[PDB]
Write a protein that binds this ligand. Sequence first.
Ligand code: HEM
Ligand code: HEM
Ligand code: HEM
Ligand code: HEM
Lengths: 146, 146, 137, 137
Amino acid sequence: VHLTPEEKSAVTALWGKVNVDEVGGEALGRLLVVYPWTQRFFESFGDLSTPDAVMGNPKVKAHGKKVLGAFSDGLAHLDNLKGTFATLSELHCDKLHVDPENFRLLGNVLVCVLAHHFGKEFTPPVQAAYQKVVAGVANALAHKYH
Amino acid sequence: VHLTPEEKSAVTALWGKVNVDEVGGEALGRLLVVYPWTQRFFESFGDLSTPDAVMGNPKVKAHGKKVLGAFSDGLAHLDNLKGTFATLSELHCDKLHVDPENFRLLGNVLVCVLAHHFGKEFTPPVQAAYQKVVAGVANALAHKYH
Amino acid sequence: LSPADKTNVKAAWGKVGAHAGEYGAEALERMFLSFPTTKTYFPHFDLSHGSAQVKGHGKKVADALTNAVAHVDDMPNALSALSDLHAHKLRVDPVNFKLLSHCLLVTLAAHLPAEFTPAVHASLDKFLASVSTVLTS
Amino acid sequence: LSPADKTNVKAAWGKVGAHAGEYGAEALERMFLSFPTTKTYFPHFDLSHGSAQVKGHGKKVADALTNAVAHVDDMPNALSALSDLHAHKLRVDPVNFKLLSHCLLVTLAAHLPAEFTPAVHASLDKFLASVSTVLTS
Ligand code: HEM
Ligand code: HEM
Ligand code: HEM
Ligand code: HEM
């Protein structure tokens, strides 16, 4: 809920380097590939029938950009993640009925994508800081269930 | 946790009939039997190596009474569970490092134990109200992780 | 499932006997009330209390569990049609199998006071998780 | 695991080689730092950075995975003693296998980018979940 200065430095140093046009689509795409029941929520996105179909799907890329933008918004408001995600929590919980376990799964896929892009720079302590962030985002998105 | 007055009456009417010297030990004992990793947190309780050892263990019974008492206190203020679980959350999260999934499991074991005791009286609507309660207790106990 | 788990499951489900269909329907009703998100998988159903559709579906669920008990050493084969249905066609979230499994345990506890001992509770939990693994594979 | 999953896992895990101790220790460190609750299984270890105990244990975990890859069609036999150790003796929470599996994927992604494609990511996730199922049975 609260990041120490070491954790904040870890997060902010890496986040400025993240390609915000691509990383969200990569994380959403891998979510759909690795956890295929999540495709139930994205029937309107078209062809998701193979990994290459998912990763090349323009709606996956476009939506992932919005998802990452919400993650970026959370990074700018770490002390009020619940208020930052309140409207999205209503959407995902009351309207879309996404089980909140999937919020955890997407956060962990994002962590995998950051590791994949940044290699040795994504050290165990840097990962630990990002895990606090994605857990905080998942809890905030789940608030309308709580 | 918000119960309607109808739901509140159903929950409280049943709870008045619960044997508070036994039901807590039964729920805790079944948690230790059905989910044996939880035994690691109770090594000082002695023999937990078989179901009959667990269910008959005097420390399991005595501890289960304390657990049930906290559920009882929570039932008295469902709208502000932080008012009964704030310190217990520090204990379970910061000091004992219990994984919060196990809070959910214990709540569901308690629901099973209530069904076992009350039979047909534990109707689908009564269960639904109790599920709201035990989810709220688990969420309150996890507050220090959030 | 250990031999002890299989023994416990066969014994418990024998006591369920001809009530299996009724218990399946009751478990579904409990699931829809306690965890209303699960209702979204059933858009064509009447989900109200006493629904003939929910009753009929619970009997199908129960028949599948009875077959799984009879074929507990070969459940991937015995449940083969249901894996494609749940994992590919319906894309049922794995969490919801835990919810239905819990409601089945609650139903069995409410109807089988003597048989739902801690050991049998543990065996039935593992059995339903094993069924769930097949349906999500 | 399909043949495609097995092919993907053998190719990706083949790239690990003599890095097994280093990558296993790194995955453990990622788990202990990211999910401090997992530390309650290792009170008898020094868990500080650079720990020789974490290094030696990390090689055992990684080498056990290598053997599992070699026996991917009969993993229950290939992991049987370790299943007794984790499920019976130590009683490891199933949640923690999900946490370590995630940290193993993170480690592989950080060290083998070209191998960690979305398809291989999925296959590795399934492999580790299958290993986890055996070790919790
Ligand atoms: C965990 C972090 C997540 C974040 C930050 C997030 C964020 C967002 C955002 C910003 C939107 C757009 C809302 C709008 O434009 O009004 C959205 C929509 C959506 N999200 Fe999420 N989401 C997350 C997780 C998930 C997961 C795990 C699922 C399902 C498995 C999911 C399913 C959806 C769906 C189905 C939509 C609507 C798609 C559409 O309208 O075309 N989300 N999400
Ligand atoms: C989810 C509902 C739970 C409730 C309402 C609850 C309640 C309590 C209460 C009232 C105490 C006594 C605290 C004190 O005297 O200071 C306690 C202690 C404790 N609880 Fe829980 N608990 C829950 C879940 C769990 C779970 C799931 C575990 C482990 C798997 C656990 C492990 C412990 C331990 C180890 C202690 C300390 C016992 C000792 O002093 O030896 N609790 N809990
Ligand atoms: C122990 C777990 C389960 C068993 C044994 C089971 C069994 C079955 C069976 C036998 C059928 C009928 C197959 C047919 O008519 O061809 C079915 C259909 C279905 N099941 Fe399950 N099921 C389980 C869990 C679930 C869960 C957890 C959900 C969702 C929360 C679910 C949702 C459905 C749906 C939506 C259908 C199709 C209903 C229709 O459109 O007619 N099932 N299931
Ligand atoms: C991919 C999953 C895992 C694999 C392949 C694995 C492998 C192993 C192996 C080979 C050993 C034997 C060490 C020896 O004989 O000296 C071991 C021991 C142990 N494992 Fe695991 N393990 C896994 C997951 C876990 C998890 C998730 C935990 C807890 C969070 C855990 C806790 C332990 C502990 C406490 C020991 C005893 C260490 C000692 O006293 O030397 N394991 N594991």
